[PDB]
Amino acid sequence: IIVGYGEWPSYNRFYTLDTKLWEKSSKGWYWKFPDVLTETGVFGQNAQFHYLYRSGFCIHVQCNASKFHQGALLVAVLPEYVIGTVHPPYKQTQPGADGFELQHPYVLDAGIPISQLTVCPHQWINLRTNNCATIIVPYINALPFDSALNHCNFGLLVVPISPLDYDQGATPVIPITITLAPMCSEFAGLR
Amino acid sequence: TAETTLDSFFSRAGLVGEIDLPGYANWDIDITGYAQMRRKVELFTYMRFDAEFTFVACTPTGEVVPQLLQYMFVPPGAPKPDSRESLAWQTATNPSVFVKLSDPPAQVSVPFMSPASAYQWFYDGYPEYGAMPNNMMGTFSVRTVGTSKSKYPLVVRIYMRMKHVRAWIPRPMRNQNYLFKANPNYAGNSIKPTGASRTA
Amino acid sequence: GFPTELKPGTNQFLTTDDGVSAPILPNFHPTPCIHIPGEVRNLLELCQVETILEVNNVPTNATSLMERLRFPVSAKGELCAVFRADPGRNGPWQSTLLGQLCGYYTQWSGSLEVTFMFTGSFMATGKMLIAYTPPGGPLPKDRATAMLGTHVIWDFGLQSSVTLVIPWISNTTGLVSIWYQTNYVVPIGAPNTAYIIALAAAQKNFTMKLCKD
Amino acid sequence: GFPTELKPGTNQFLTTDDGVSAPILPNFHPTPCIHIPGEVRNLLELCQVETILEVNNVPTNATSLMERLRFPVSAKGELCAVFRADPGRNGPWQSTLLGQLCGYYTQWSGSLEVTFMFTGSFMATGKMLIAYTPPGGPLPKDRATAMLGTHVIWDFGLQSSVTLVIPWISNTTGLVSIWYQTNYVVPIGAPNTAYIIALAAAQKNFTMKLCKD
Amino acid sequence: GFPTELKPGTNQFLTTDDGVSAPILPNFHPTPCIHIPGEVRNLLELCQVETILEVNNVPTNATSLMERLRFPVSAKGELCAVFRADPGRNGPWQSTLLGQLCGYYTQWSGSLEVTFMFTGSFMATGKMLIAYTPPGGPLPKDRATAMLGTHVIWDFGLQSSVTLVIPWISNTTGLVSIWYQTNYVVPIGAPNTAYIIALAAAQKNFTMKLCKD
Helix, strand or coil: CEEHHHCCCCCCCCEECCCEEECCCCCCEEEEECHHHHCCHHHHHHHHCEEEEEEEEEEEEEECCCCCCEEEEEEEEEECCCCCCCCCCHHHHCCCCCCEECCCCCCCCCCCCHHHHHHCCEEEEECCCCCEEEEEECCCCCCCCCCCCCECCEEEEEEEEEEEECCECECCCEEEEEEECCEEEEEEEEC | CHHHEHHHHCCCCEEEEEEEECCEEEEECCHHHCCCCHHHHCCEEEEEEEEEEEEEEECCCCCCCCCEEEEEEECCCCCCCCCCCCCCCCCCCCCEEEEECCCCCEEEEECCCCCCCCEECCCCECCCCCCCCCCCCCEEEEEECCCCCCCCCEEEEEEEEEEEEEEEEECCCCCCCCCCCCCCCCCCCCCCCCCCCCCC | CEEEEECCCCCCCCCCCCCCCEECCCCCCCCCCCCCCCEECEHHHHHCCCEECCCCCCCCCHHHHHHHHCEEEECCCCEEEEEECCCCCCCHHHCCHHHHHHHHEEEEEECEEEEEEECCCCCCECEEEEEEECCCCCCCCCHHHHHHCEEEEEECCCCCEEEECCCCEECCCCEEEEECCCCCECCCCCCCEEEEEEEEEECCCCEEEEECC | CEEECCCCCCCCEECCCCCCCCCCCCCCCCCCCCCCCCCCCCHHHHHCCCEECCCCCCCCCHHHHHHHHCEEEECCCCEEEEEECCCCCCCHHHCCHHHHHHHHEEEEEECEEEEEEECCCCCCECEEEEEEECCCCCCCCCHHHHHHCEEEEEECCCCCEEEECCCCEECCCCEEEEECCCCCECCCCCCCEEEEEEEEEECCCCEEEEECC | CCCEEECCCCCCCCCCCCCCCCCCCCCCCCCCCCCCCCCCCCHHHHHCCCEECCCCCCCCCHHHHHHHHCEEEECCCCEEEEEECCCCCCCHHHCCHHHHHHHHEEEEEECEEEEEEECCCCCCECEEEEEEECCCCCCCCCHHHHHHCEEEEEECCCCCEEEECCCCEECCCCEEEEECCCCCECCCCCCCEEEEEEEEEECCCCEEEEECC
């Protein structure tokens, strides 16, 4: 496990999002947190009927690939990941539990280099080394509580650093599974 | 190690904004006024610092004239002056400084103004997207003391130095050219590599 | 009263002077600071994080800038890639955060640490030679003289990532070259080209001086 | 003599500076202060006093300005009155001393305490629903959803005054609505209309910052 | 505030004033100093080293300036050389480091120490009289009165170097003359001319005052 910034979240089940099909032309995907869980589940039922909110997260990413596929994935959390357009639309700014595709993974839709993401809590998914990457992120904000609907704490970025390669005949799509479990969640202001 | 501390990294007062009075002007406090300092502050996500401001006023030719000036600081939430005789000038809750151009430059200190616990440079949400609401430090308004029109043209330079800098959540440094002061968008068609290239 | 005289250098404004000035709001209490996780106090902590080193900074095309993060290894005693151990000067080290922070300072000195990551099929095997030449030495003419210096023999059938530690740098610079010790051997049904990712960082003894914009 | 230099920021006049100045009458003795009863040291004491909240700020006529201090209750599941829990913004809270002192400051935060007083005949009975909706929530569509939130059921046949405590406010705001739980029942010979007086105050944890004229 | 008045002599710039001024780089750390061998703290150490005294400052020709470092002794009661014991004034003492540093000061006082070195064949023998005359005394008319004063009888068949200590000098000056006590006797096959080298220095009690460019 990677404990983000060395702090365990302080003061509740696994959620499985849609699988993402990693291909030869894939550029990357990003999910906005906790907006990814607002629309779905009992957790998202509290988010839309409460004023304030605070919670950590336990993001777990898995890739199901054989021994004849190759590639590397960089999974990293970026607190306050603001999008920079070539204003963004709503669907691009806060995509639901379906992420969005990066059009410019080099600048990461924010004018910042992909090469320097390792300064953030991250793990490498190398298909010949491991298929799992789990990151424990605490609550990060300037205030103890914040609105879950109008503000995203961080954005989980999953970018193919090296393209997926395979021989013709093998499965051309590698599913990517993300399982996130809210940890030390709090709510207030029942509306 | 003592060289690379945050205080040393963010010391060395830099020119933030120049004011021309060829009879008053408002200058909203903005650290980004220093041209090369935005890319330095964006390297973290949160900040908490106190600022020292220095006002060096002179004519466009740099010559020093015997004129009285008033710089008033309106804290966040206060209304701005709309003319040279507005009632906002005499308000006691907007601190002022009266200094002649002969005296050494005025030097005032402004503490941490944000209602939050840190200045945040990226808002991943709405209060219009990306509008960090509680990052407003205040405003500095400059006018020449007097009712009639002043006899000299003035240029006012502002130098700001942060003390007691604290930072959080480091992030990758900007590599693309900046386009707008508020949102971080770039030029997609004219996208460039981080550095130089070679042939092999 | 108390007799004093103004020494030379009064009424001057030194933009580096750290004298305490009068508060504009004496009665103001700023909001007390809370514990935000991940507080940084020294930039050396941000210099000691591994970061992608664009060794393959050949392409400049807009739709293929992403190909610079890694350099290919595919199908004997040949030269794969070569780059200088120069964090601050122009070149591949511009991409890493250490090489970007070196542009904010004038002098730096210490030990580097550059790791490589192999991104091939699990059934792919082979060996590669990573040699470092001290400052002044030219690029070796072949693997025979490349092995004589400081080097590591990296086989990626067993270990997928190796670390090469640059002994010492300061602001001629050292050279790092990578050689095909053995050809690229792969089974039937596995991709015939692979990639290597270079992650560069600084050791605990790296320091900087003379901050410069 | 003792060597000093004038640092930048001398000969300036900061209107907030608290430096001690020379007395104009050094030999004067001001008359010693006596104990006058009712000395106030902190304005929070003046903020913690209950004060009439003009919920019924509909009329503006000169001869009927006195009708704003109370709102009528007279002759089932209807809406009596609604007001925002916003001490500083324009509205009913302008009348109370807390809401007037909020205009002298920029930021405030804490818990309120709004009490109601029923001013009907002793033989008059009935029930009324006082619901508070957290910030963001809209006005309830009916008493059925008004009861689900935070509320008190106020019957004035037994108790003539009730207190509703607003949990927390800061500078969207909360809503307070009052509903007819049951109709107004009165005996023969007693007046068929009554009035309710709202007295609003601040708890012990209310504070203000950034004084502003 | 604290009452002071500017005493006369303020806002002046005295080029000899040693007042501490504001650093231009407060956050700079200069590189720590290492132990370089041969550290000098007082110039008197550099004054206490023996140094060639060009007694034979007769020639000025470009190709023969090297002949001034020594004066010849070759083939009875005659005068060899004479020079003044004046480190600072113009003359032979300009060549020594003591006599060059005396030009940077106005006043000096103490004891000198002038040694001679004979540079003849090992089989060459003879005697020479080195007499010192106190200040005021004229040059002696002959060796008979030269011996009566302070003198040493130097024979170089036994000892090849002798030291003459000047008692005391200050800024009339003393005289040092060298006489042929006996003729120059040499065997067959050895050179018939020899040379003497004068090495002059200062004792431990030499001091200087009033530094002057």
